[PDB]
Amino acid sequence: SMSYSWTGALVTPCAAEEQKLPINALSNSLLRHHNLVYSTTSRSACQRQKKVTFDRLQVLDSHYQDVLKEVKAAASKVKANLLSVEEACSLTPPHSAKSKFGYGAKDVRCHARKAVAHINSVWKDLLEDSVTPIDTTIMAKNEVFCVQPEKRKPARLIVFPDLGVRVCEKMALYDVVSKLPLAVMGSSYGFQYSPGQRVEFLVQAWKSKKTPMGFSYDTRCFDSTVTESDIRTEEAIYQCCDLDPQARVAIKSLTERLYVGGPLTNSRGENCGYRRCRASGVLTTSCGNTLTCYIKARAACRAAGLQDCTMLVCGDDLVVICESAGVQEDAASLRAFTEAMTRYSAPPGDPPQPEYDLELITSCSSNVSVAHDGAGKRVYYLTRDPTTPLARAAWETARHTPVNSWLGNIIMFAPTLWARMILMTHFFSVLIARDQLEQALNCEIYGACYSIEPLDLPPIIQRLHGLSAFSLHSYSPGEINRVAACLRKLGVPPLRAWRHRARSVRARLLSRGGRAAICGKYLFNWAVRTKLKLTPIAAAGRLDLSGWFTAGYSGGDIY
Numbered sequence: 001s002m003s004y005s006w007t008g009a010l011v012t013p014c015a016a017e018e019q020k021l022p023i024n025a026l027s028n029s030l031l032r033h034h035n036l037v038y039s040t041t042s043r044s045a046c047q048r049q050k051k052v053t054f055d056r057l058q059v060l061d062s063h064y065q066d067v068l069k070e071v072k073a074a075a076s077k078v079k080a081n082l083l084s085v086e087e088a089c090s091l092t093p094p095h096s097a098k099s100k101f102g103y104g105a106k107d108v109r110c111h112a113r114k115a116v117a118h119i120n121s122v123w124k125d126l127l128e129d130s131v132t133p134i135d136t137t138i139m140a141k142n143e144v145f146c147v148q149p150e151k152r153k154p155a156r157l158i159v160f161p162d163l164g165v166r167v168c169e170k171m172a173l174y175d176v177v178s179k180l181p182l183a184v185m186g187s188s189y190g191f192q193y194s195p196g197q198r199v200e201f202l203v204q205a206w207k208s209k210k211t212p213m214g215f216s217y218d219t220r221c222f223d224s225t226v227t228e229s230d231i232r233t234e235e236a237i238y239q240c241c242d243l244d245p246q247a248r249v250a251i252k253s254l255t256e257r258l259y260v261g262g263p264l265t266n267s268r269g270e271n272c273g274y275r276r277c278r279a280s281g282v283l284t285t286s287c288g289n290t291l292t293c294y295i296k297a298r299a300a301c302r303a304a305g306l307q308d309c310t311m312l313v314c315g316d317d318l319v320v321i322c323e324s325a326g327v328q329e330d331a332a333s334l335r336a337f338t339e340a341m342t343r344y345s346a347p348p349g350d351p352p353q354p355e356y357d358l359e360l361i362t363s364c365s366s367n368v369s370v371a372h373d374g375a376g377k378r379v380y381y382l383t384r385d386p387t388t389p390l391a392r393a394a395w396e397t398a399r400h401t402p403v404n405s406w407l408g409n410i411i412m413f414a415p416t417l418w419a420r421m422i423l424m425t426h427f428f429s430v431l432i433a434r435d436q437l438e439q440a441l442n443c444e445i446y447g448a449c450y451s452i453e454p455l456d457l458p459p460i461i462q463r464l465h466g467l468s469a470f471s472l473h474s475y476s477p478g479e480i481n482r483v484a485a486c487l488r489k490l491g492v493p494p495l496r497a498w499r500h501r502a503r504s505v506r507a508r509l510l511s512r513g514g515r516a517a518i519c520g521k522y523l524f525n526w527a528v529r530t531k532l533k534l535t536p537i538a539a540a541g542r543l544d545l546s547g548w549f550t551a552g553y554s555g556g557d558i559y
């Protein structure tokens with residue numbers, strides 16, 4: 001079956017969409033080459049629709065069936081609870097698409113009477129009807145990128161049910177999604193890790209092999225490759241859990257009326273077509289993709305005969321580290337792995353490449369790199385090309401955005417040369433200029449939403465990355481060059497200009513005392529020759545990373 005069928009109605013916007021990077025003096029101080037920066041809009045939705053629409057080939061073999069049996073046996077050990085309306089209401093991210101039934105995300109989060117009454121009626125309908133297709137809205141996602149030399153990218157398409165339904169999905173399945181992937185894949189479940197644990201996992205996996213070979217596997221439009229039978233098997237896996245009788249019913253209804261497919265409506269209420277694949281904006285998107293990718297990859301590793309595989313899976317992101325059998329055999333065994341994945345309806349985007357250096361693997365848009373701490377000890381950390389984070393940071397300084405990628409990037413990429421010298425310096429000077437140091441901000445990290453005050457960044461970074469995050473130096477030539485080439489391309493000031501700017505930022509923060517002085521001391525110790533002694537921050541031990549800062553969860557894409 002075709003992943004999509006279209007009517008000719010266009011994917012339409014809700015409000016005006018700006019494609020060009022807006023400019024103000026502060027955003028320009030970060031990046032001057034504004035013409036290279038763009039936002040994706042509904043104008044390119046037609047281009048994305050052609051890429052994501054294809055027929056699926058699915059031939060399951062004994063290797064696939066063997067892994068599915070292990071997953072179902074592992075799933076039987078899970079006990080998951082039905083969430084109450086209130087609980088599901090509190091997990092709703094701020095700014096998620098309002099309901100067409102007269103209430104929005106704010107009403108849901110406040111447990112407003114009107115929102116709760118509607119959600120309750122949606123839930124009763126899921127218990128009484130297991131068949132009628134649920135309507136979905138299709139929107140073109142607005143995301144910021146820098147133009148590429150070889151290739152603007154078309155907008156990604158987001159398919160989501162109404163807000164009331166989204167809350168019901170958490171009531172029936174939030175507890176399943178929070179427990180099932182870890183129970184099923186153990187150490188291979190990538191979402192349990194911080195950046196420091198992911199790097200430790202990859203380095204340890206690499207060192208455990210006699211002659212390691214690794215690869216990232218890029219599935220072409222993963223969501224579209226997900227078949228009706230893949231979605232029905234995810235439901236069969238969910239049912240292996242010890243569940244409440246009402247959750248079992250709602251899970252079946254959600255699968256048959258929404259997850260497997262259904263009608264697509266644009267923002268103007270016109271019929272856009274029909275979906276027979278993964279919806280990008282459902283609670284089970286991330287969990288379902290993680291499970292389905294793990295099943296197909298584990299079976300494909302066996303079908304290819306790859307020796308001693310260690311896998312790390314994050315949604316559709318897959319990385320495999322195995323025991324090399326020589327370059328000719330590895331290239332042939334990777335083609336056999338690809339052929340098996342293709343047969344399982346997971347064909348490649350870019351064909352995988354065997355890598356013999358851990359640093360040359362890109363996975364979760366990142367790579368392993370090395371630096372040294374204050375004692376000169378070797379430290380492995382995760383980094384990436386800063387182009388996209390910098391372009392988005394410039395947009396976010398010119399325009400107030402509900403969700404700030406800059407904050408999530410400073411958090412996830414805190415040990416990096418670029419996040420420290422550029423992102424930290426820039427945002428703390430902008431927060432000083434605007435008097436917003438104490439204002440809590442929203443950010444999203446792979447669907448997990450957080451509400452964080454910039455003044456809490458130092459204890460957050462210490463708890464997440466460790467004290468070494470404030471003392472890394474002696475970055476690699478490749479890393480330095482990648483950042484430096486990025487600055488020249490984007491019109492971003494050189495690192496030495498950022499160092500001088502940071503010394504002024506640092507002084508202003510120190511003079512404010514309290515939490516601001518801690519920001520100046522810890523985050524900007526790299527900017528001074530005469531180093532301050534960085535002792536554990538007391539607030540780092542008091543906090544709880546996972547629970548104190550949570551603003552909810554979106555199982556799939558934005559809105």
Ligand SMILES: O=C(NC1CC1)c1ccc(N2CCN(S(=O)(=O)c3ccc(OC(F)(F)F)cc3)[C@@H](C(=O)NCc3ccc(OC(F)(F)F)cc3)C2)nn1
Nearest residue numbers: 191193194195198286287364366382445446448450545549
């Ligand atoms: O969809 C999910 N589950 C469904 C499928 C079943 C889901 C999604 C996210 C998520 N989390 C918690 C763990 N962490 S976390 O980093 O420990 C962290 C914890 C607290 C915190 O709090 C703050 F914000 F307050 F600091 C901030 C961060 C984040 C993460 O995505 N990790 C993986 C990862 C790690 C490194 C990577 O690589 C590179 F580093 F390059 F990005 C890429 C991915 C966010 N948990 N679950």
